[PDB]
Scaffold this active site. Structure first.
Site, PDB file in Angstrom:
ATOM      1  N   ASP A 121       2.402 -35.397  64.189  1.00  0.00           N
ATOM      2  CA  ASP A 121       1.822 -34.205  64.794  1.00  0.00           C
ATOM      3  C   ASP A 121       1.406 -33.209  63.710  1.00  0.00           C
ATOM      4  N   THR A 159      -2.159 -30.774  71.154  1.00  0.00           N
ATOM      5  CA  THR A 159      -1.236 -31.886  71.055  1.00  0.00           C
ATOM      6  C   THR A 159      -1.455 -32.929  72.135  1.00  0.00           C
ATOM      7  N   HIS A 309      -4.167 -33.921  65.057  1.00  0.00           N
ATOM      8  CA  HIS A 309      -5.053 -32.768  64.710  1.00  0.00           C
ATOM      9  C   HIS A 309      -4.454 -32.199  63.421  1.00  0.00           C
ATOM     10  N   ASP A 683     -28.985 -32.603  82.680  1.00  0.00           N
ATOM     11  CA  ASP A 683     -27.596 -32.847  83.036  1.00  0.00           C
ATOM     12  C   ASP A 683     -27.108 -31.677  83.839  1.00  0.00           C
ATOM     13  N   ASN A 685     -25.274 -31.620  86.437  1.00  0.00           N
ATOM     14  CA  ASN A 685     -23.869 -31.630  86.878  1.00  0.00           C
ATOM     15  C   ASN A 685     -22.842 -31.736  85.712  1.00  0.00           C
ATOM     16  N   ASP A 687     -21.932 -33.746  83.453  1.00  0.00           N
ATOM     17  CA  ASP A 687     -21.022 -34.901  83.303  1.00  0.00           C
ATOM     18  C   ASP A 687     -21.320 -35.715  82.032  1.00  0.00           C
ATOM     19  N   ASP A 691     -29.071 -37.396  84.587  1.00  0.00           N
ATOM     20  CA  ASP A 691     -29.226 -37.097  86.031  1.00  0.00           C
ATOM     21  C   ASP A 691     -30.241 -38.028  86.670  1.00  0.00           C
TER      22      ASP A 691
HETATM   23  C1  LIG Z   1     -16.270 -41.569  79.390  1.00  0.00           C
HETATM   24  O1  LIG Z   1     -15.739 -42.794  79.907  1.00  0.00           O
HETATM   25  C2  LIG Z   1     -15.308 -42.751  81.247  1.00  0.00           C
HETATM   26  C3  LIG Z   1     -14.640 -44.034  81.747  1.00  0.00           C
HETATM   27  O2  LIG Z   1     -15.564 -45.108  81.704  1.00  0.00           O
HETATM   28  C4  LIG Z   1     -16.501 -42.391  82.160  1.00  0.00           C
HETATM   29  O3  LIG Z   1     -15.898 -41.960  83.362  1.00  0.00           O
HETATM   30  C5  LIG Z   1     -16.231 -42.831  84.468  1.00  0.00           C
HETATM   31  O4  LIG Z   1     -17.547 -42.589  84.962  1.00  0.00           O
HETATM   32  C6  LIG Z   1     -17.992 -43.150  86.193  1.00  0.00           C
HETATM   33  C7  LIG Z   1     -19.264 -42.400  86.642  1.00  0.00           C
HETATM   34  O5  LIG Z   1     -19.061 -40.981  86.701  1.00  0.00           O
HETATM   35  C8  LIG Z   1     -16.939 -43.027  87.317  1.00  0.00           C
HETATM   36  O6  LIG Z   1     -17.319 -43.895  88.384  1.00  0.00           O
HETATM   37  C9  LIG Z   1     -17.054 -43.347  89.712  1.00  0.00           C
HETATM   38  O7  LIG Z   1     -15.719 -43.665  90.124  1.00  0.00           O
HETATM   39  C10 LIG Z   1     -15.320 -43.338  91.452  1.00  0.00           C
HETATM   40  C11 LIG Z   1     -13.899 -43.867  91.660  1.00  0.00           C
HETATM   41  O8  LIG Z   1     -13.070 -43.110  90.801  1.00  0.00           O
HETATM   42  C12 LIG Z   1     -11.653 -43.405  90.913  1.00  0.00           C
HETATM   43  O9  LIG Z   1     -11.276 -44.706  90.453  1.00  0.00           O
HETATM   44  C13 LIG Z   1     -11.317 -44.950  89.039  1.00  0.00           C
HETATM   45  C14 LIG Z   1     -11.001 -46.437  88.744  1.00  0.00           C
HETATM   46  O10 LIG Z   1      -9.617 -46.762  88.705  1.00  0.00           O
HETATM   47  C15 LIG Z   1     -10.456 -43.902  88.297  1.00  0.00           C
HETATM   48  O11 LIG Z   1     -10.446 -44.048  86.889  1.00  0.00           O
HETATM   49  C16 LIG Z   1     -10.938 -42.486  88.656  1.00  0.00           C
HETATM   50  O12 LIG Z   1     -10.196 -41.531  87.889  1.00  0.00           O
HETATM   51  C17 LIG Z   1     -10.700 -40.166  87.955  1.00  0.00           C
HETATM   52  O13 LIG Z   1     -10.133 -39.413  89.022  1.00  0.00           O
HETATM   53  C18 LIG Z   1      -8.707 -39.321  88.987  1.00  0.00           C
HETATM   54  C19 LIG Z   1      -8.187 -38.520  90.176  1.00  0.00           C
HETATM   55  O14 LIG Z   1      -9.195 -38.383  91.143  1.00  0.00           O
HETATM   56  C20 LIG Z   1      -8.211 -38.697  87.669  1.00  0.00           C
HETATM   57  O15 LIG Z   1      -6.814 -38.878  87.520  1.00  0.00           O
HETATM   58  C21 LIG Z   1      -8.924 -39.237  86.417  1.00  0.00           C
HETATM   59  O16 LIG Z   1      -8.657 -38.359  85.331  1.00  0.00           O
HETATM   60  C22 LIG Z   1     -10.442 -39.422  86.626  1.00  0.00           C
HETATM   61  O17 LIG Z   1     -11.038 -38.129  86.628  1.00  0.00           O
HETATM   62  C23 LIG Z   1     -12.321 -38.029  85.957  1.00  0.00           C
HETATM   63  O18 LIG Z   1     -13.423 -38.654  86.641  1.00  0.00           O
HETATM   64  C24 LIG Z   1     -13.827 -38.059  87.889  1.00  0.00           C
HETATM   65  C25 LIG Z   1     -14.921 -38.902  88.561  1.00  0.00           C
HETATM   66  O19 LIG Z   1     -14.337 -40.109  89.000  1.00  0.00           O
HETATM   67  C26 LIG Z   1     -14.222 -36.584  87.670  1.00  0.00           C
HETATM   68  O20 LIG Z   1     -14.590 -35.943  88.877  1.00  0.00           O
HETATM   69  C27 LIG Z   1     -13.066 -35.833  86.982  1.00  0.00           C
HETATM   70  O21 LIG Z   1     -13.459 -34.534  86.619  1.00  0.00           O
HETATM   71  C28 LIG Z   1     -12.625 -36.546  85.704  1.00  0.00           C
HETATM   72  O22 LIG Z   1     -13.694 -36.429  84.791  1.00  0.00           O
HETATM   73  C29 LIG Z   1     -10.838 -42.320  90.188  1.00  0.00           C
HETATM   74  O23 LIG Z   1      -9.482 -42.420  90.574  1.00  0.00           O
HETATM   75  C30 LIG Z   1     -16.309 -43.887  92.493  1.00  0.00           C
HETATM   76  O24 LIG Z   1     -15.878 -43.489  93.778  1.00  0.00           O
HETATM   77  C31 LIG Z   1     -17.754 -43.426  92.200  1.00  0.00           C
HETATM   78  O25 LIG Z   1     -18.666 -43.959  93.177  1.00  0.00           O
HETATM   79  C32 LIG Z   1     -19.689 -43.052  93.734  1.00  0.00           C
HETATM   80  O26 LIG Z   1     -20.932 -43.101  93.023  1.00  0.00           O
HETATM   81  C33 LIG Z   1     -21.455 -44.439  93.004  1.00  0.00           C
HETATM   82  C34 LIG Z   1     -22.553 -44.650  91.954  1.00  0.00           C
HETATM   83  O27 LIG Z   1     -22.470 -45.984  91.497  1.00  0.00           O
HETATM   84  C35 LIG Z   1     -21.886 -44.901  94.409  1.00  0.00           C
HETATM   85  O28 LIG Z   1     -22.158 -46.292  94.394  1.00  0.00           O
HETATM   86  C36 LIG Z   1     -20.804 -44.629  95.468  1.00  0.00           C
HETATM   87  O29 LIG Z   1     -21.425 -44.602  96.738  1.00  0.00           O
HETATM   88  C37 LIG Z   1     -19.962 -43.344  95.246  1.00  0.00           C
HETATM   89  O30 LIG Z   1     -20.566 -42.258  95.963  1.00  0.00           O
HETATM   90  C38 LIG Z   1     -19.686 -41.733  97.005  1.00  0.00           C
HETATM   91  O31 LIG Z   1     -18.785 -40.742  96.515  1.00  0.00           O
HETATM   92  C39 LIG Z   1     -19.433 -39.570  96.015  1.00  0.00           C
HETATM   93  C40 LIG Z   1     -18.419 -38.640  95.349  1.00  0.00           C
HETATM   94  O32 LIG Z   1     -17.305 -38.467  96.198  1.00  0.00           O
HETATM   95  C41 LIG Z   1     -20.228 -38.880  97.133  1.00  0.00           C
HETATM   96  O33 LIG Z   1     -21.017 -37.850  96.595  1.00  0.00           O
HETATM   97  C42 LIG Z   1     -21.177 -39.856  97.839  1.00  0.00           C
HETATM   98  O34 LIG Z   1     -21.880 -39.161  98.873  1.00  0.00           O
HETATM   99  C43 LIG Z   1     -20.419 -41.147  98.236  1.00  0.00           C
HETATM  100  O35 LIG Z   1     -19.446 -40.894  99.240  1.00  0.00           O
HETATM  101  C44 LIG Z   1     -18.121 -43.798  90.738  1.00  0.00           C
HETATM  102  O36 LIG Z   1     -18.334 -45.190  90.599  1.00  0.00           O
HETATM  103  C45 LIG Z   1     -15.506 -43.287  86.803  1.00  0.00           C
HETATM  104  O37 LIG Z   1     -14.501 -42.998  87.756  1.00  0.00           O
HETATM  105  C46 LIG Z   1     -15.171 -42.519  85.523  1.00  0.00           C
HETATM  106  N1  LIG Z   1     -13.826 -42.876  85.039  1.00  0.00           N
HETATM  107  C47 LIG Z   1     -12.971 -42.017  84.478  1.00  0.00           C
HETATM  108  C48 LIG Z   1     -11.613 -42.538  84.020  1.00  0.00           C
HETATM  109  O38 LIG Z   1     -13.217 -40.814  84.322  1.00  0.00           O
HETATM  110  C49 LIG Z   1     -17.286 -41.217  81.600  1.00  0.00           C
HETATM  111  O39 LIG Z   1     -18.489 -41.057  82.305  1.00  0.00           O
HETATM  112  C50 LIG Z   1     -17.600 -41.336  80.099  1.00  0.00           C
HETATM  113  N2  LIG Z   1     -18.171 -40.099  79.593  1.00  0.00           N
HETATM  114  C51 LIG Z   1     -19.345 -40.090  78.910  1.00  0.00           C
HETATM  115  C52 LIG Z   1     -19.879 -38.761  78.401  1.00  0.00           C
HETATM  116  O40 LIG Z   1     -19.924 -41.161  78.647  1.00  0.00           O
HETATM  117  O1  LIG Z   2       6.437 -30.216  69.779  1.00  0.00           O
HETATM  118  C1  LIG Z   2       5.656 -30.249  70.769  1.00  0.00           C
HETATM  119  C2  LIG Z   2       4.564 -29.284  70.739  1.00  0.00           C
HETATM  120  C3  LIG Z   2       4.416 -28.405  71.889  1.00  0.00           C
HETATM  121  C4  LIG Z   2       3.427 -27.385  71.926  1.00  0.00           C
HETATM  122  C5  LIG Z   2       2.654 -27.234  70.781  1.00  0.00           C
HETATM  123  N1  LIG Z   2       1.601 -26.388  70.452  1.00  0.00           N
HETATM  124  N2  LIG Z   2       1.227 -26.715  69.156  1.00  0.00           N
HETATM  125  N3  LIG Z   2       1.868 -27.681  68.670  1.00  0.00           N
HETATM  126  C6  LIG Z   2       2.839 -28.084  69.625  1.00  0.00           C
HETATM  127  C7  LIG Z   2       3.806 -29.150  69.569  1.00  0.00           C
HETATM  128  N4  LIG Z   2       6.008 -31.082  71.858  1.00  0.00           N
HETATM  129  C8  LIG Z   2       5.322 -31.385  73.153  1.00  0.00           C
HETATM  130  C9  LIG Z   2       5.518 -32.946  73.215  1.00  0.00           C
HETATM  131  C10 LIG Z   2       6.932 -33.153  72.586  1.00  0.00           C
HETATM  132  C11 LIG Z   2       7.243 -31.929  71.732  1.00  0.00           C
HETATM  133  C12 LIG Z   2       6.422 -34.247  71.619  1.00  0.00           C
HETATM  134  C13 LIG Z   2       6.679 -35.680  72.030  1.00  0.00           C
HETATM  135  N5  LIG Z   2       5.368 -36.053  72.631  1.00  0.00           N
HETATM  136  C14 LIG Z   2       5.227 -37.380  72.982  1.00  0.00           C
HETATM  137  O2  LIG Z   2       6.223 -38.159  72.873  1.00  0.00           O
HETATM  138  C15 LIG Z   2       3.931 -37.893  73.506  1.00  0.00           C
HETATM  139  C16 LIG Z   2       3.425 -39.046  72.914  1.00  0.00           C
HETATM  140  C17 LIG Z   2       2.220 -39.480  73.440  1.00  0.00           C
HETATM  141  O3  LIG Z   2       1.557 -40.543  73.012  1.00  0.00           O
HETATM  142  C18 LIG Z   2       1.955 -41.099  71.767  1.00  0.00           C
HETATM  143  C19 LIG Z   2       1.040 -42.335  71.695  1.00  0.00           C
HETATM  144  C20 LIG Z   2      -0.482 -42.160  71.709  1.00  0.00           C
HETATM  145  C21 LIG Z   2       0.230 -42.576  70.420  1.00  0.00           C
HETATM  146  C22 LIG Z   2       1.587 -38.798  74.479  1.00  0.00           C
HETATM  147 CL1  LIG Z   2       0.105 -39.276  75.203  1.00  0.00          CL
HETATM  148  C23 LIG Z   2       2.180 -37.649  75.018  1.00  0.00           C
HETATM  149  N6  LIG Z   2       3.353 -37.216  74.518  1.00  0.00           N
HETATM  150  C24 LIG Z   2       4.242 -35.107  72.316  1.00  0.00           C
HETATM  151  C25 LIG Z   2       4.949 -33.802  72.002  1.00  0.00           C
HETATM  152 CA   LIG Z   3     -25.562 -35.724  84.757  1.00  0.00          CA
END
Ligand SMILES: *[C@@H]1O[C@H](CO)[C@@H](O[C@@H]2O[C@H](CO)[C@@H](O[C@@H]3O[C@H](CO[C@H]4O[C@H](CO)[C@@H](O)[C@H](O[C@H]5O[C@H](CO)[C@@H](O)[C@H](O)[C@@H]5O[C@H]5O[C@H](CO)[C@@H](O)[C@H](O)[C@@H]5O)[C@@H]4O)[C@@H](O)[C@H](O[C@H]4O[C@H](CO)[C@@H](O)[C@H](O)[C@@H]4O[C@H]4O[C@H](CO)[C@@H](O)[C@H](O)[C@@H]4O)[C@@H]3O)[C@H](O)[C@H]2NC(C)=O)[C@H](O)[C@H]1NC(C)=O
Ligand SMILES: O=C(c1ccc2[nH]nnc2c1)N1C[C@@H]2[C@H](C1)[C@H]1CN(C(=O)c3cc(OCC4CC4)c(Cl)cn3)C[C@@H]21
Ligand SMILES: [Ca+2]
Ligand SMILES: [Cl-]
Ligand SMILES: [K+]
Ligand code: NA
EC number: 3.1.4.39
Length: 806
Positions: A121, A159, A309, A683, A685, A687, A691
């Site tokens: 870290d 972190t 970092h 872009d 939206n 993302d 678009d």
């Molecule tokens: C960086 O790399 C990443 C990973 O490859 C790229 O992100 C991917 O981009 C894809 C396009 O945007 C996207 O695909 C969509 O997925 C939808 C299903 O999503 C769920 O399932 C996946 C798979 O397991 C999962 O990973 C997703 O996880 C997201 O959401 C959860 C919780 O909700 C979070 O925990 C997680 O962090 C993640 O969040 C991120 O992504 C979402 C978008 O999914 C953002 O909103 C968040 O802010 C955050 O960034 C989900 O659990 C799927 O449903 C989509 O399908 C729609 O569009 C298609 C087009 O093909 C269409 O066919 C369908 O009809 C459908 O439309 C319908 O739904 C619409 C919306 O509700 C609605 O408007 C319509 O009217 C329809 O009803 C789509 O396929 C993919 O999920 C993400 N993956 C991740 C991990 O983010 C990213 O783009 C890259 N970045 C760059 C700059 O290159």
């Molecule tokens: O001291 C810090 C800390 C807090 C605030 C700060 N502000 N500025 N500096 C800061 C430093 N913290 C937070 C947590 C705890 C103590 C450490 C253990 N941890 C994981 O064990 C871990 C490991 C992980 O992945 C290790 C794998 C990817 C290689 C991930 Cl994802 C998340 N947490 C990450 C840190």
């Molecule tokens: Ca866009």
């Protein structure tokens, strides 16, 4: 509740997590307050310390000891790491000469070389040179293995966002860990450093490496260590797991050190107090390598020494207070510190207005040390917008500074002398990467690269198929001796049309005029040749970009430039031209000032029109190939074609004109010719992805002409600048940018001055990778070069940061 009255006997650091209320014995039980009553006693032994001494050699095993110097310890897997050195005449790993590891040299029963990820870290990049005298083990890994001069973190350079990016290959906007502190509104929940919410799985998106591994049948050590578990015990636990029977032994492990971050916050990055924590990290590396050597694994395991970092000098007296800018200071909530994030304190308040908050913070003091942005206006290279957890209003804070709400927040919340979080291009925030082992190259330096790329490589090292991520798979193949991933170019989805002359002038009714009616088979065969592409090899040096989505578009050839013109968006998707070192800049003749010409290759119905620009009181226009760079007065007429025109706000035309009139020629002079590809980006939206037509929120008034959110250029030349850009026999050099297409220049506090005082500074801030432009346009560049595809993938991930030398 946990019925914590079971036992850890024979379960210490067990690998399958047990479900409540059976008590836990894993490296995370402390943090859940759920360990069995006897966890400390059985699993955290400390008796006699961590090192064998002469008098312990051949001792009778005492199970109470933290580690063992008894004859049976090697086969039990629990010797002190210095056992063979003290008791068997062996040398420490650091004292051995390095020898190339050409093939993995593993014990029988090892199916693949294990991967150990050693994360540190706050390990700033320059520590590798500046601390070199006190880190011999680390300096050996670095000089014998594969290393980069630095590795770029993600923004914010905090972190959890960076560790989880390492684990997933995703930008924080995609994985969801967008700060060390966050508010989600769909959950209606908050994630904090202290406390229990951060443990709910709902924060953590994507698929981290341990899960990728598990799903594909590769076993993982548990990655996280309770803070109070000392480092020596973490090392011994890893070494013990490496002695498990084949069917039970993991292939991937993580070690984590809180240092040097912990001390760096207290003493600053180069405080004299920092020498010790670096010594202590090095000794821990030493214990690992010694322990691996005893187990005959030092030429079998791949080790990654990686930081999250860096660390900057930051003190209480360098804090800007929102109270000095805002009168409504209690109607807002600020996520403070090395970045700022602002939201409304209450959603029942309809008086709250982001535009007046932004205006109140824009260019208000001469030396102001932060700049406000609506998140969609942040530099696109930060990829920091597409998450509901990222507040609409963002403050980018100058390096060395903090932002806070009110002074009371700072003396009732100077302690600290270091901090991090700033823009990920800042030199002080850069961190480290070293790869050492049979799969990495021997004594090899590689160029700096981004930490989003490492997930794919760690997957490659373990034979895993990576989950979809933001790395560019293949861009880090040059780090590897073997296990390379052989990437292939994506297939073009839309093929272009090559229209000839198909329309008469009078068929156009676009409200455009040009003074161009001044009337020879010498120069008539010639102009025909140019329109059919006779000069195309000059202006299109790496092949035409491929269009990776379904659309309708035309290639248009000209003496000075080639373009791929979209019939859907009514403007080019890309415009490609070369400007040699010797090229001359000229002015737009007076008679040609407002000249716009119909293009007889393209229907009225697929053309823009001048009347819409007349009627739209906010919107003007510019040209993608600039008239200033025409090769002759006759060629200049080509630049005024309606098919080379794009919508531009007057405020933006100031930026664009300066780039086209002044900066392109400066780059050609400095780089020995440049090839330029420019175009629009939509872009709406935010993302990061191109678009579709139905996502466009803004049109030139009364038309179907869509308004770009940004304009890009990719500027390529020969890496060997003794060769001109158009006759380059080797590797290329590129810088690119994605400029926001804005109706004001509020972002630039000096914009009232001449463009020579502010435009290039703006363009620098909006520097970009080719790959960022590829996502934003659905285009694929550099399809026809003499270079290997992996090298081109590296080139496409390059970012020109404009920082001075590390
Ligand atoms: C960086 O790399 C990443 C990973 O490859 C790229 O992100 C991917 O981009 C894809 C396009 O945007 C996207 O695909 C969509 O997925 C939808 C299903 O999503 C769920 O399932 C996946 C798979 O397991 C999962 O990973 C997703 O996880 C997201 O959401 C959860 C919780 O909700 C979070 O925990 C997680 O962090 C993640 O969040 C991120 O992504 C979402 C978008 O999914 C953002 O909103 C968040 O802010 C955050 O960034 C989900 O659990 C799927 O449903 C989509 O399908 C729609 O569009 C298609 C087009 O093909 C269409 O066919 C369908 O009809 C459908 O439309 C319908 O739904 C619409 C919306 O509700 C609605 O408007 C319509 O009217 C329809 O009803 C789509 O396929 C993919 O999920 C993400 N993956 C991740 C991990 O983010 C990213 O783009 C890259 N970045 C760059 C700059 O290159
Ligand atoms: O001291 C810090 C800390 C807090 C605030 C700060 N502000 N500025 N500096 C800061 C430093 N913290 C937070 C947590 C705890 C103590 C450490 C253990 N941890 C994981 O064990 C871990 C490991 C992980 O992945 C290790 C794998 C990817 C290689 C991930 Cl994802 C998340 N947490 C990450 C840190
Ligand atoms: Ca866009
Ligand atoms: Cl944060
Ligand atoms: K106008
Ligand atoms: Na301004």
């Amino acid at each position: 509740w946990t019925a914590t009255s079971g036992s850890c006997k024979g379960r210490c650091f067990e690998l399958q997590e047990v479900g409540p209320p059976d008590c836990r014995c894993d490296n995370l039980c402390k943090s859940y307050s759920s360990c069995c009553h006897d966890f400390d006693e059985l699993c955290l032994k400390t008796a006699r310390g961590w090192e064998c001494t002469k008098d312990r050699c051949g001792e009778v095993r005492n199970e109470e000891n933290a580690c063992h110097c008894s004859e049976d310890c090697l086969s039990r897997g629990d010797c002190c790491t210095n056992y063979q050195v003290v008791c068997k005449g062996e040398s420490h790993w650091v004292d051995d000469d390095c020898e190339e590891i050409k093939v993995p040299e593993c014990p029988a029963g090892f199916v693949r070389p294990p991967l150990i990820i050693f994360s540190v870290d706050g390990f700033r990049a320059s520590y590798m040179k500046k601390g070199s005298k006190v880190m011999p083990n680390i300096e050996k890994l670095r000089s014998c293995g594969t290393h980069a001069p630095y590795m770029r973190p993600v923004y914010p350079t905090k972190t959890f966002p960076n560790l989880y990016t390492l684990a997933t290959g995703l930008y924080p906007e995609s994985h969801g860990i967008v700060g060390n502190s966050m508010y989600d509104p769909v959950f209606d929940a908050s994630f904090h450093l202290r406390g229990r919410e951060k443990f709910n799985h709902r924060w953590w998106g994507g698929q981290p490496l341990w899960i990728t591994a598990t799903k594909q049948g590769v076993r993982a050590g548990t990655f996280f260590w309770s803070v109070s578990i000392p480092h020596e015990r973490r090392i011994l636990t890893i070494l013990q797991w490496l002695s498990l029977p084949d069917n039970e032994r993991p292939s991937v492990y993580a070690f984590y050190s809180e240092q040097p971050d912990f001390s760096g916050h207290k003493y600053g990055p180069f405080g004299p107090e920092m020498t010790n924590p670096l010594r202590e990290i090095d000794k821990t590396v030493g214990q690992l390598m010694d322990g691996l050597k005893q187990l005959r694994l030092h030429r079998c395991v791949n080790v990654i020494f990686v930081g999250d970092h860096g660390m900057e000098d930051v003190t209480c007296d360098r804090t800007e207070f929102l109270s000095n800018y805002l009168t409504n200071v209690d109607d807002i909530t600020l996520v403070p510190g090395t970045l700022g994030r602002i939201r409304a304190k209450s959603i029942n308040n309809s008086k709250y207005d982001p535009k007046t908050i932004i205006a109140a913070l824009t260019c208000k003091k001469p030396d102001q040390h932060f700049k406000p942005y609506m998140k969609q206006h942040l530099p696109k290279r930060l990829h920091y917008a597409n998450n509901r957890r990222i507040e609409d209003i963002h403050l980018l804070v100058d390096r060395r500074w903090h932002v806070a709400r009110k002074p009371l927040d700072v003396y009732k919340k100077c302690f600290f002398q270091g901090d991090h979080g700033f823009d990920n291009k800042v030199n002080s925030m850069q961190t480290v990467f070293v790869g050492y082992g049979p799969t990495f190259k021997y004594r090899t330096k590689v160029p700096p690269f981004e930490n989003i790329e490492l997930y794919n490589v760690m997957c490659d090292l373990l034979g895993l198929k990576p989950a979809p991520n933001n790395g560019t798979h293949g861009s880090l193949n040059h780090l590897l001796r073997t296990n390379t991933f052989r990437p292939t170019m994506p297939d073009e989805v839309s093929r272009p049309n090559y229209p000839g002359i198909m329309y008469l002038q009078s068929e156009f009714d676009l409200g455009c005029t040009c003074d161009d009616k001044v009337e020879n088979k010498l120069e008539e065969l010639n102009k025909r040749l140019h329109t059919k592409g006779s000069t195309k090899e000059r202006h299109l040096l790496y092949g035409r970009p491929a269009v990776l989505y379904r659309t309708s578009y035309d290639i248009l050839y000209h003496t000075d430039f080639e373009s791929g013109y979209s019939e859907i968006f009514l403007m080019p998707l890309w415009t490609s031209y070369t400007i040699s070192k010797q090229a001359e800049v000229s002015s737009i003749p007076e008679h040609l000032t407002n000249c716009v010409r119909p293009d007889v290759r393209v229907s009225p119905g697929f053309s823009q029109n001048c009347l819409a620009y007349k009627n739209d009181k906010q919107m003007s226009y510019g040209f993608l190939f600039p008239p200033y760079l025409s090769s002759s007065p006759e060629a200049k007429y080509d630049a005024f074609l309606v098919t080379n025109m794009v919508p531009m706000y007057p405020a933006f035309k100031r930026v664009w004109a300066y780039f086209q009139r002044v900066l392109v020629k400066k780059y050609a002079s400095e780089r020995n010719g440049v090839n330029v590809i420019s175009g629009p980006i939509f872009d709406y939206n935010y993302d990061g992805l191109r678009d579709t037509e139905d996502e466009i929120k803004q049109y030139v008034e009364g038309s179907s002409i869509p308004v770009p959110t940004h304009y890009y250029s990719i500027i390529t030349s020969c890496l060997d600048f003794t060769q001109p850009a158009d006759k380059c026999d080797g590797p290329l050099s590129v810088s690119s940018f994605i400029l926001p297409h804005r109706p004001d220049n509020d972002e630039s506090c000096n914009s009232s001055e001449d463009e020579s005082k502010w435009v290039e500074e703006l363009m620098k801030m909006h520097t970009a990778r080719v790959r960022d432009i590829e996502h934003l346009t659905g285009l694929d560049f550099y399809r026809k070069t003499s270079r290997s595809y992996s090298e081109i993938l590296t080139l496409k991930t390059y970012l020109h940061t404009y920082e001075s030398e590390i």
